[PDB]
Amino acid sequence: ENLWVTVYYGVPVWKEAKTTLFCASDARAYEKEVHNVWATHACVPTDPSPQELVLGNVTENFNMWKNDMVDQMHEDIISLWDQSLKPCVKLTPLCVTLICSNATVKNGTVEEMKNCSFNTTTEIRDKEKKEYALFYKPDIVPLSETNNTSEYRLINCNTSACTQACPKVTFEPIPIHYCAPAGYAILKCNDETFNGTGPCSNVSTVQCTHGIRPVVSTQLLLNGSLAEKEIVIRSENLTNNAKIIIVHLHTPVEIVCTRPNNNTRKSVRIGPGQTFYATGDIIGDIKQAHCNISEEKWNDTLQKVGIELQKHFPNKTIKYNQSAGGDMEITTHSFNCGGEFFYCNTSNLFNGTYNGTYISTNSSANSTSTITLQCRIKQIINMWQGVGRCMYAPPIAGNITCRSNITGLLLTRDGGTNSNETETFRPAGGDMRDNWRSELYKYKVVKIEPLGVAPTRCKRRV
Amino acid sequence: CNTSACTQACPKVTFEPIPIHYCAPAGYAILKCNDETFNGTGPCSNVSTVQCT
Amino acid sequence: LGFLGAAGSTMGAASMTLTVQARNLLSGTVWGIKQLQARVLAVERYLRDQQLLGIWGCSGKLICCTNVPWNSSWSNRNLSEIWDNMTWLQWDKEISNYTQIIYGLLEESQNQQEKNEQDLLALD
Amino acid sequence: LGFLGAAGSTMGAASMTLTVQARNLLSGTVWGIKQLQARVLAVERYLRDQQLLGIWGCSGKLICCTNVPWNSSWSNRNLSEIWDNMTWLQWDKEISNYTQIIYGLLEESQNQQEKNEQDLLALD
Amino acid sequence: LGFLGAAGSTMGAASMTLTVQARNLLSGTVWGIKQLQARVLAVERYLRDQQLLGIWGCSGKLICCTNVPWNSSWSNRNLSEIWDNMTWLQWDKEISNYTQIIYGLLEESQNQQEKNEQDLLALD
Ligand SMILES: *[C@@H]1O[C@H](CO)[C@@H](O[C@@H]2O[C@H](CO)[C@@H](O[C@@H]3O[C@H](CO)[C@@H](O)[C@H](O[C@H]4O[C@H](CO)[C@@H](O)[C@H](O)[C@@H]4O)[C@@H]3O)[C@H](O)[C@H]2NC(C)=O)[C@H](O)[C@H]1NC(C)=O
Ligand SMILES: *[C@@H]1O[C@H](CO)[C@@H](O[C@@H]2O[C@H](CO)[C@@H](O[C@@H]3O[C@H](CO)[C@@H](O)[C@H](O)[C@@H]3O)[C@H](O)[C@H]2NC(C)=O)[C@H](O)[C@H]1NC(C)=O
């Protein structure tokens, strides 16, 4: 009959809530220098401990498109890039005119670059000297309103002064571990069939999320994690066709890209105590950069995406098309190949249709054959807003290769047609949250509310 | 101008060696080897504690 | 059971191992002011519970009977249905509405009870 | 009465509602380092009183009788004149001079009383 | 004896004046973020001991018997040899290896003892 209220503390109770999260990184990165890189220079060393602990039974709900953790990651990456560009020279004298030789070819089919000449400051403020430096064509703009062929200028000096990235600090995607502070926790949707919303069946708790790679790409997702089961389609909505649709592959597709040209760095002094780096000469013959992808593997992968994508477009075809054109920074598969910012035309990849039946890898003329893409290269890189924008990527000598794995797609859909099944998909992208959201679909943060109340047969002794 | 751009020191700020006292924070302490024959290593014989060097 | 393994299990099971959760309010070393902000936030949040549980006379750690009776309208349940099958994690959701009056009672009752420790000691 | 409504009223009136003032050591969210400085200062200042009141054995919250007798030279007053008409706010001003000896006595008395809880427990 | 004057003297002598060391976790005002870091570190480090000693039921300040016995293999000594001649400063070095099991025992013993305060109060 008589029951008195008793207060419990240390209760297992929580709410999903907002908070800032630590960095964390593995110990091996800490052998390196200062400012090289943030994973060491701006982030706490952490063994991924305490280990994962599965919860025996939990009633839980999730939503990955409204998650604030990805917005926090966006803020961190942008504000950290702004910090990383601070200690380097901001160019500025290179707004001088460039007088560039008017080369003409019989459609050589290999981009020649433009060899330019201009004035630079010697070791005294007052005396000047002529210099030269080869520049990639897309970064060089003609100056005259008339039809002049002689004079040119850099693409910047109309928006802002670009800052050279110091070659001492690299761009490799060192993994980042996100750790919640004390009083909070991260609940991990351990379910294998989770599709981005609703309730999860199986949940675990982990102090520190494992292995997020800050790798940026527009259309294909490189070096990401792999799903445990079918090639799940994910989207915030499918009534709103403008909502970007993210595809997460089960097995990888190898991609290898390279720049055969043997460029050579040049050192151009710009005022006191700083240098401007550019391409001085090209050793050997001139050739074309690219990306190679296994052929039958991509065919099988794009049919496998079809058999899963078929269900939400039930009676209709899964037919693919190129991107819808536009800005080359949008349409092209843009990524960094270890120092050089490639921009690939993907039109060879997305061209075909599917009719609902799975097909084998045979017959094969020769399994070593590969589909090839053609890619350009820049040095003046405009990628993010509010970060001081344009950054001049320095040259890198020798030749390069960046063999990697394709593990996802970012796609977009056109409108309906004629009550007809040929509504087609297009690659697209550019909102970076979509890149990091593909890796954070598992996690969600909570705040522990460890104080609670309940009755029991116990008066106070007083 | 071969190395970097030098910076003039403002004459309003001086260079005199004003003494500095180093104080340990709360929870910490400094033990002072009060021995007169200590030679830079090994055990000390006489020790004191001081909040601020 | 660690940090949250007791969650979902019955309130009887979760009544033990409270010390494991109380011990888990430390973390981190700092880059930047964000992580320092996290540290100060955590310390203030912990002290808020510490000095609020203390006002109810519950300095005896973390299970503490009080003199306030349970108004059955809050739950309308027998002690078996509250405790034997339900879990804390959903019980907090169910009780979430009524907290203000409960906390006020738990404050005022000990506020008026403490003087009697003087009164029943001043006779000597 | 809230934060300071009990001020000016008699010490008898202000003896109650102490919990309203103890609960009022939280505030703020931060722009810049000034507000964070304020937060850390507040936390340290609170813990100063908390860990100092505890050393006198007064873990029973916030009214706590002690064995030390009152030296009448400090006030030279009867319990009616101290309590029935005066207010705490001026009483602190009146008593402001003598505090060091009082605090030393409260420290040492509990420092020597604590061992006797071992001594009258070791007989078994 | 102040901050560390009792160091080196016997453990019996150092058993007194614990209040002098407990009162010495306060210092500093700040230039730059380094000193602010020092303040926050000190506060967290103090609260770690405060909230860990409390879980063992030792809310009675800073000397606190408990129910767990001495496993003689840890020291293999009589109470005279532990106490009458040895000093705390070397005793910590000697005992430094065995701390984890001791802390686990001190946690679990109070974790299981606390419910009996309900059980021997629910009869009424
Ligand atoms: C890219 O274009 C730049 C200029 O736009 C060009 O740089 C110039 O190259 C020439 C040739 O190497 C340099 O001039 C040489 O200087 C040496 C110094 O020892 C002289 O011996 C050379 O004299 C011979 O060659 C001349 C023709 O170049 C003859 O006229 C002369 O009679 C001699 O036979 C020659 O003068 C010049 O200094 C640079 N200019 C700058 C600014 O650096 C570069 O070669 C082009 N690169 C490519 C890959 O197209
Ligand atoms: C610069 O160009 C040279 C030649 O054009 C590149 O050499 C090639 O590098 C690749 C790297 O993967 C070599 O791959 C081989 O892989 C097999 C496994 O399939 C492995 O067993 C071999 O030991 C080898 O690593 C390839 O053999 C090699 N040569 C050729 C003709 O392709 C070089 O990689 C380029 N440098 C950079 C920095 O990109």
Numbering used by the authors:
A (entry chain E): 32 to 139, 150 to 185, 185A, 185B, 186 to 309, 312 to 321, 321C, 322 to 354, ...
B (entry chain A): 196 to 248
C (entry chain F), D (entry chain L), E (entry chain B): 520 to 547, 569 to 664
What does the paper say about this structure?
The HIV-1 Env is a trimer of gp120-gp41 heterodimers that are heavily shielded from the host immune systems by N-linked glycosylation and further protected from neutralization by conformational masking and considerable sequence variability. A glycosylated region near the base of the third variable loop (V3) of HIV-1 Env forms a supersite of vulnerability that is targeted by antibodies originating from diverse germline genes in multiple HIV-1 infected individuals.
Comparing the structure of the UCA+G57R-bound complex with the I5-bound complex revealed further shifts in the orientation of the antibody orchestrated by the other acquired mutations in the I5 intermediate. The I5 intermediate showed further rotation about the phi dihedral in the direction of the S27Y mutation without additional changes in the theta rotation angle. Together, these results demonstrate that early mutations in the DH270 clone facilitate improved contacts, shift the position of the antibody relative to the bound Env, and alter Env conformation, particularly of the V1 loop and N301 glycan, with the angular and conformational changes further strengthening antibody-Env interactions. The early I5 and I3 intermediates recognize only the Envs that harbor these shorter V1 loops and the G300N mutation. We demonstrated the early G57R and S27Y mutations that were required for acquisition of heterologous breadth by the I5 intermediate antibody altered antibody orientation relative to Env, and this shift in antibody position likely affected downstream antibody development.
